[PDB]
């Protein structure tokens, strides 16, 4: 994640194995319960798309539903693309590129360049437009496996 | 399970039958005004004889507190 | 939460897991309780109504309370609007804006504002105003789930 | 707990969940076994009049004994406002109040109240004077609960 | 349940008795005034006949240690 | 239970009995000299006759790794 130093910038530090774990036992115990919403919700408080992708990838089990999520994180990237165009002309030196549905599926970006967007002046939040995706695609499992 | 298909016993506790209803509330997604209209309508509807001929005698206007208390001895 | 860093300012720190755990395990152990009040009163220790709702929300079972208690929240705050009508006038741009019901309980309120209000001098306790619904709203179900 | 910050002043910082759950997890295990004292002792290291209220109300179970010592510590309480009267005329401006026997189980003061008193110069030990009164009141059940 | 519930048992133990007394007067939100009256009063009239005899003996003035040693045996 | 009705059994291990004695004496509150008082007199006196004239041959003052190994076969 991306979290403020006691100097007053903001750095990337890694998650924590027990913080890990807690996802994972999360998954274990309450699988598409809707509590597990706000769960990864305040478990996700200033995470990367790297660390999104991280955590969506390291699940075992429920395949039909990760995969349902996966074709949802396109269609709702694919969507990213369709309304926003790509801008005029080529890419100022002095500026920094913005970003398409695969940078902010975490894919095509780096984490540098990740960092890049979040921190800059103004910062632009790529993480919030992947939560909405993944807690909308979150509302279609829970939709489907109530049963 | 769909939201119609919450229903009490003919034992159950309503108790146990409105911690059921909540929770499955808790997984519908609809407009906040269209789950007041359940809240007040369904819940009753889907409720046993016994209490809904209780809630039947609360009125209109009652809350939560005063019907799990109401239908405690059902 | 809003904590004290060691510069010597109020700043926002995220929630621990252990701590969020230790929230879940006491509900799963001691249920409607009254040990339960002294002890989400130290785990809700400098919390925001961000964390309070998130707290809230996390719960899984007895969702009959659940629902008693986020009707009390409700009128609670509602009560708050009746007993402080809005302000004279427009809001001045050397300050920023009175809270109502419902930032209180964090819905209109985003983060920033809710740090705004409890760092700014004067502060306004609306953490203390939620805590106090909570409390009271607990004492009702602790009434009635009396057996 | 008022603990030393590096900076070299005394400040207020929170008890911990872990530590919290220890004190717990004693009382569980060991009930009103002599090993508690000692135990108590230092769990209460450098801890408040209301830290000590918050140990005691999250109690759970053994009623019996928790309301003896409630009536020990204002018996205790009710005896040190006995041995210590009120002060001559009103309270200065420049100073603040001397503690009532309520002050010191915490009921009548403040935190920051609390704080000022042990902080201060001279320093008042409101908390040790409390802890003689919950290790007298442990005597008094280790003897009752002696079989 | 309600605090004139609480009672002794015949073969009931006074201690599990008074602990469960302490925990229903822990759910009881009343004036401290209300709760004394409650505790000298209802404590002892609840309680089974051969320690409610062995109660009447200690007279007023009483403590919880002495309550509590008191009926011991019975 | 009280200090006097610490006892050592007919076929009870002396140690586990000192076990039992100093943690009742854990329990005490009375001042050392007493409770010196009690260390030279209710142990011994409380101790089985095989033991108890084992500790006689022992003397007057004997420590207590010398009574632990001298009542052991005991």
Known sequence: P?????????????????????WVKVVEE???????????????EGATPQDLNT???????????????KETIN?????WDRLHPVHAGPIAPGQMREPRGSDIAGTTS??????????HNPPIPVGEIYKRWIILGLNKIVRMYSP | TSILDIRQG?????????????????????????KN?????????????????????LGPGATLEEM???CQGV
């Not at chain 1, 309450?30 to 305040?42: L, Y």
């Not at chain 1, 269609?75 to 969507?79: I, M, N, T, V």
């Not at chain 1, 780096?110 to 921190?119: A, H, N, R």
């Open chain 1, 55 to 69: 955590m969506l990838n390291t699940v075992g089990g429920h395949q039909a539903a990760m995969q349902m999520l």
């Open chain 2, 68 to 70: 799990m208390t109401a």
């Open chain 1, 110 to 119: 780096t984490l540098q360049e990740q960092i890049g967007w979040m921190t």
């Open chain 1, 75 to 79: 269609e709702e990237a694919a969507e």
């Open chain 2, 10 to 34: 003919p034992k159950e506790p309503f108790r146990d039958y409105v911690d059921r209803f909540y929770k499955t509330l808790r997984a519908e997604q609809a407009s906040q005004e269209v």
């Open chain 1, 2 to 22: 991306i979290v403020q130093n006691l100097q007053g910038q903001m750095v990337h530090q890694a998650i924590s194995p027990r913080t890990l774990n807690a």
């Open chain 2, 37 to 57: 209209w359940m809240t007040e309508t369904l819940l009753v509807q889907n409720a046993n004889p016994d209490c809904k001929t209780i809630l039947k005698a």
């Open chain 1, 30 to 44: 309450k699988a598409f319960s809707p509590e597990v919403i706000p769960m990864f919700s305040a478990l996700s």
